[PDB]
Structure formats: structure tokens, C-alpha cells
Amino acid sequence: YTRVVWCAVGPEEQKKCQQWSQQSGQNVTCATASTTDDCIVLVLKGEADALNLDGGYIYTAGKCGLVPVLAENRKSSKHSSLDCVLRPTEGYLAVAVVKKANEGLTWNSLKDKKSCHTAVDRTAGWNIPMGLIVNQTGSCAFDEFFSQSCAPGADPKSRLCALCAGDDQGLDKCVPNSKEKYYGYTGAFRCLAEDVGDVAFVKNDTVWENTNGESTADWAKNLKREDFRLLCLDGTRKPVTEAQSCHLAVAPNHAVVSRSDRAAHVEQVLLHQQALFGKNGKNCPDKFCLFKSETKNLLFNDNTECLAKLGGRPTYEEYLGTEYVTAIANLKKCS
């Protein structure tokens, strides 16, 4: 074995990565970059070995020869005697969320409203919704569909960044890392909870984990699920309890990627690392938990039960599924 160098995106992932590094006895060390794309560049250069990516990034990195190693696997919906590591991943539900009190709003009245996206180029917050929107409007002007948005990663002086808030000091407005207040699943849902935006494009799981006391964070601790509605593609609205019949698409689970070169070694170390810091892991909660960071989803989504092995040694296209792959392809024609 040698060490595995993980790539942390932003200072909060860096700090968490260093805690992990320390606990692993340098078996895992850290490289840090300002963006996911930058981390994908470090891995390509061979300065970093791997990182966990959202589907939209798995596509980007895949075009560059990086490969899926293990996928995030969460609380299995069905009953499974199968170990978490061996269980097939189910994929998460991408949804569009609005305030119940925002009464006139349906999927069909989204034009000129304010939007909250996890980040440009991501599955639930971006590829799915804009793909859908571009298709339905028959126009590639997705930068002008919404009057204003927070879409971390877009031009900071553009409308797509208008609603973004930057860090503590108001710096880094719209950067695609956790320093941006409205970045990622939780940040985009916060953007909605605080009424900065009219709709948030996140995943089903995010609504639940930040409402009804599930989150103690100050902005979320008082949020209640009844106050939110999901927007279905048929123009109707439903309670956040009906994501199964009111989502925009099913999305491929985030997955760890690495140089094909190091795929095997990276997989080795992570299986061992989660046996140590995963859910029910030997040293979690006692010394360190790889899948916790207080609803901030650093390095891995906090709801991750384990990293699962991938059946069929899949290519990035097979991992993502041909439907999602063409979906992304078409949307990129637009740029």
C-alpha cells in the first residue's frame, strides 16, 4: 500500500480531510483545491488520488479518463440482509421545491422566478432542471429563464449568481464550494428556506434532513415540511412526502473516482478506511466519522451509510446510465 491523497474542495473539506488524515495515521493525506473541477485537475496531474463526485462531475472526470471506484450508498429503502457495501445503489430523487405559501407556483409558472441551484454542472441542482427547461422552452438561453438565481460556479456578475451570498465576510460570492452560503444541497435549500429564491433544485433527501428538527442549524431548526411543496412535471404540487411520484428524475449516486491507474489501490484503502470511520465503524463516533460533518456534507453526503462496491466494473457512462448521459450531452450543446 501507499498513501491515498484525497482532494478536499474548499477550507471546510480541507479541515475535515486533515482530521481524517491524522486519524488514519497518514494513510490518507490531503490535497485541497478551490473547486471540484480543480480537484479533478489535481487527480489528472497525479497530485491527488481521488475524491467523491456528484454525477455531473463523474461525467466531466469520465471524459478525462477518471473512473468510478465506490458509490455512496444510503439507508436502503427495502429490507436487505445484504451488507451495505454489496447492496446495489438505488439513486436519489431530484426534485424542485417551493414554499407552500408561494401559492401560484407550479413547474409551468417557473419563468421569471428566482432559483436556487446546488451548483452549475450538478445532477439535481443543474443538469436535470435546466435540461428539462431547455427542452421544454426549446431554447438554449437557460441563463435568462429565471430572473435571478444562485447557481454556484456561474459568472459572479451574472444573474445566475445574483442571489448567491458569499462567505462570512461576503467574499467568494458564487464560488462552488462550501464557503458560499447557498452552495450545494443544503445551501440551495437554505436559499429557499430564507426566501431568497422561489424554488430550489435539490434532492428529496435534503428537504427531510433540514426540516422538522432534523437539523439544529439556526436557519433550519424551525423549518417544517408542511410549509414546503414539491413541483411535479405535470404542473401539480405535492407534499414533500410524495417525492416518489413527483420528482424530476432519478439521479446516480455520488461516487468516488480516481485515475484508472489507482482505482484498485484507492478502492482497497477506502474499504479499510470505512471499516474504521464509517457507520458503526470501529472508530466512529469515538475518534472520527467519515460520514459526518453536521449536515454540511463535507467530502461525503452525511446520509451516506457506506461506500458500496460497483457491480459489473462499470465505465463512467455505464455508472451514470445512458439516459442521464445523453441528457447531459444535449444540455452541453447549449454552450
Partner: peptide, 6 residues
């Protein structure tokens, strides 16, 4: 749909 975008 081919070249690595970097």
C-alpha cells in the same frame, strides 16, 4: 462529446 474538457 469526446475531448476531456481540460
Amino acid at each position: 462529446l469526446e475531448a476531456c474538457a481540460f
